[PDB]
Amino acid sequence: MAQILPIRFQEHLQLQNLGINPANIGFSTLTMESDKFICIREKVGEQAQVVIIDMNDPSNPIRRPISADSAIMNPASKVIALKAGKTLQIFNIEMKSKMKAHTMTDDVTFWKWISLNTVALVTDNAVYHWSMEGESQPVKMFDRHSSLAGCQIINYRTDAKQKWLLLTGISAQQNRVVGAMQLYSVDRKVSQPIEGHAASFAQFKMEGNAEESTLFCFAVRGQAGGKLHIIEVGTPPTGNQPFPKKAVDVFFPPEAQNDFPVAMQISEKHDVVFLITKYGYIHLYDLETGTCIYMNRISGETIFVTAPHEATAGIIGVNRKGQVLSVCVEEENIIPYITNVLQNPDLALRMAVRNNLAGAEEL
């Protein structure tokens, strides 16, 4: 019989079936800020357009003319952010109304929604946050560290309280793709350059602690190999024991000498880290210990964008073919998998009780 798997795959959609041209399925033209929408910039005739796919009604996409170089949908609402060099505009689509506009000093080269109501803007020189509340304008958070100069910016994220900020770029150095991160502390107003490829923050409440710890998790393929780090940022909430830092290996098989991490999402429902590699591997790690639960190759196709999958507290992504795919914990299998296949009853029992999962009645 087929081995039980600790994760479940699910294909949601094939974008080519909605008549999206594969030429436009890629990092610069297709954005997925949340699991609620996908926006694709396309040129049909001489007219530039955006295609907005509502994931609750995906067979009826809307197409609208644009003149923007980038389009990103709010994570929760049909509110779109558009830009053209320095010119930023926010529209409420259903109201057909321009909510907000701003012209920056410098071109915005990367931007992303970091919350329901705040957009982060990256220029060649700095990072700003722009709240949609009231008449708020963009506020500069920090100046970019020289170690990200010349990098392609691929991600920006924050902790839940927006006190720890993380900018990630990549470049080619000595024939490998090297990740450069800038971690910034809002409270200290200090940056630290870190070599890393993909990361996420997470809230985690250690047994015995009254308050959640804020954890920084990142994966890197360095010169000396793959590593995953899980570390508390900042002084522990008063009362708390500190979270002991974890550093574990990230395996790459000998035939994947050029692979590296591209995406990370953390389930706080299951306290697991999902890591996806450039050339299509999925890894699952326990957030508490860093133990590797599972690795498999989804396929040969690069998954270039991901988001949290809210329904399953998993990860949803798009690959270059336009397959929209999710991975989540298989709640009925994960505990017996850990016990029987990994032969790790210790981890199995902990996860069973920690995350209220069945299966540890036996081992």
């Binding site: 971690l183 630290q192 940022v233």
Partner: peptide, 6 residues
């Protein structure tokens, strides 16, 4: 720096 000690 020294935000975190890896």
């Amino acid at each position: 720096d020294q935000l975190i000690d890896l």
